[PDB]
Design a binder for this molecule. Structure first.
Ligand code: HEM
Ligand SMILES: CC[C@@H]1C(=O)OC[C@@H]1Cc1cncn1C
Length: 464
């Protein structure tokens, strides 16, 4: 009846001394090279259990999937959410807001023809945008996020933002900034020492500012929607939820009230924007570093699709190389290295170890994506990871950027279809040029913390 081994914590600071807040993953991966695939850490006051490799992670989150289905803290987002919404909540609230969210996204056609024709249409609205930069050197950052956010916006708001909207440019700035903070040294020190640091001046404060800015906005769309509602036919995600808040007024235990609504919508709007767009911004850089991979994707396009029409999402079965490249950007790029934290919601026996009720769990998603048993060159960019000798597509149990188990990314379906199309559609129209030689492109991360962020680069989209 004892915890997993680990370095001796100090009082209050925990294992501050053996942790590099500038790369948290490598610090935790060094400790496991010494203790094992399951060890115990303290980030400040918080006792965490950290899981390493495909085996540790799968047996935790899938084989005992119920007991590891809790949610732990991300103190940056916990300052805003306070345990409300679909993503950062626990128990009876998590199961209801999740059950309702999946059912509703399917209403608006996630992984269906509706959202296909929305993405397909927005993808062309971006093609125009990039054909009108005329080959000149740009930052791809806010072009991509604009386009990516517009898909999720259609679902949650009822329609899209205009690309010329000054206030829209602002909301995307608020996501990029709050998100990049979680990845920085101070971001990872804030995980450790939130209790103190939320009252101290510093970068943390600028990130509450933008979080606060984001909530405000969403709560202004909830007001406008609320007063102009039509109870017998819904326009968007907010409306459907409003319709369920009415029906649930007689029930005092309901999880469908104003604050849960507002929080769950931000979960969706924030996640539908910054994780598919970073993945693309990373993927472009990885394509200009690897020109022989770019040329091969282009060729698979012209023979399967051509130049005339617009790529669908079933054009995908006849495209094994391009679908490998997209899985390999997703695995190399390593979006959320430690995932969202979990928690055991009751006393738990796991592998001879004991985990008390409320124990926090770090499922290292990045160490599965770099499990050397499943990948032959774990830290190189090789699309042959996702192919066999006959050139067809090879699924891997260690491809887990979207997590596994009971609290896994229900936004995975939307994201898969978005990635395929955006990537195919852009590269069907343009080839990418860098202002620097392929041997001189630094494809290593700028910040790695809660997210993996790629470095800054300028680029050209010149037509074919
Ligand atoms: C490449 C893009 C994306 C990646 C790599 C990604 C990855 C992840 C990961 C690792 C989790 C953690 C789940 C856990 O607790 O174990 C997660 C959760 C979540 N994701 Fe995504 N995600 C992406 C895009 C999206 C999109 C487009 C949406 C919008 C519908 C979304 C919505 C969510 C939500 C609501 C959760 C919380 C689930 C819960 O706590 O029940 N994600 N995602
Ligand atoms: C930026 C934090 C995001 C949020 O508020 O809701 C969930 C989320 C974390 C996340 C999950 N999938 C993508 N992201 C960025």
């Amino acid at each position: 009846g004892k915890l997993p081994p680990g370095p001796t914590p100090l009082p209050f600071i925990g294992n501050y001394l053996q942790l590099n807040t500038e790369q948290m993953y490598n610090s935790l991966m060094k400790i496991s090279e010494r203790y094992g695939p399951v060890f115990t850490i303290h980030l400040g006051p918080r006792r965490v259990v950290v899981l390493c490799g495909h085996d540790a992670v799968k047996e935790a989150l899938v084989d005992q999937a119920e007991e590891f289905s809790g949610r732990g803290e991300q103190a940056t987002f916990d300052w805003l959410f306070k345990g409300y919404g679909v993503a950062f909540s626990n128990g009876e609230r998590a199961k209801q807001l999740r059950r309702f969210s999946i059912a509703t996204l399917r209403g608006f056609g996630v992984g269906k023809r509706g959202i296909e024709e929305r993405i397909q249409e927005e993808a062309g609205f971006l093609i125009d945008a990039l054909r009108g930069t005329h080959g000149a050197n740009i930052d791809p950052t806010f072009f991509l996020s604009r386009t990516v956010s517009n898909v999720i916006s259609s679902i949650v708001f009822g329609d899209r933002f205009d690309y010329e909207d000054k206030e829209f440019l602002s909301l995307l700035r608020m996501m990029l900034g709050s998100f990049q903070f979680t990845a920085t040294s101070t971001g990872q020190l804030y995980e450790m020492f939130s209790s103190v640091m939320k009252h101290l001046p510093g970068p943390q404060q600028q990130a509450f500012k933008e979080l606060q800015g984001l909530e405000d906005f969403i709560a202004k769309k909830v007001e406008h929607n609320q007063r102009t509602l039509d109870p017998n036919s819904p326009r968007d995600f907010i409306d459907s939820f409003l319709i369920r808040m009415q029906e649930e007024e007689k029930n005092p235990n309901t999880e469908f009230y104003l604050k849960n609504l507002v929080m769950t919508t931000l979960n969706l709007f924030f996640a539908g924007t910054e994780t598919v767009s970073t993945t693309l911004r990373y993927g472009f850089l990885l394509l200009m570093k690897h020109p022989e991979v770019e040329a091969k994707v282009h060729e698979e396009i012209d023979r399967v699709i051509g130049k005339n029409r617009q790529p669908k999402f079933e054009d995908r079965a006849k495209m094994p190389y391009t679908e490998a490249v997209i899985h390999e950007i997703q695995r190399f790029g390593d979006m959320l290295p430690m995932g969202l934290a979990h928690r055991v919601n009751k006393d738990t026996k796991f592998r001879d170890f004991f985990l008390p009720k409320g124990t926090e769990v770090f499922p290292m998603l990045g160490s599965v994506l770099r499990d050397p048993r499943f990948f032959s060159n774990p830290r190189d960019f090789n699309p042959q990871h996702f192919l066999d000798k006959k050139g067809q597509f090879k699924k891997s149990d260690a491809f887990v950027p979207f997590s596994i188990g009971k609290r896994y990314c229900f936004g995975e379906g939307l994201a898969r279809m978005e990635l395929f199309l955006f990537f195919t559609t852009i590269m069907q129209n343009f080839r990418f040029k860098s202002p620097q030689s392929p041997k001189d492109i630094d494809v290593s991360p700028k910040h790695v913390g809660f997210a993996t962020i790629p470095r800054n680069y300028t680029m050209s989209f010149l037509p074919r």
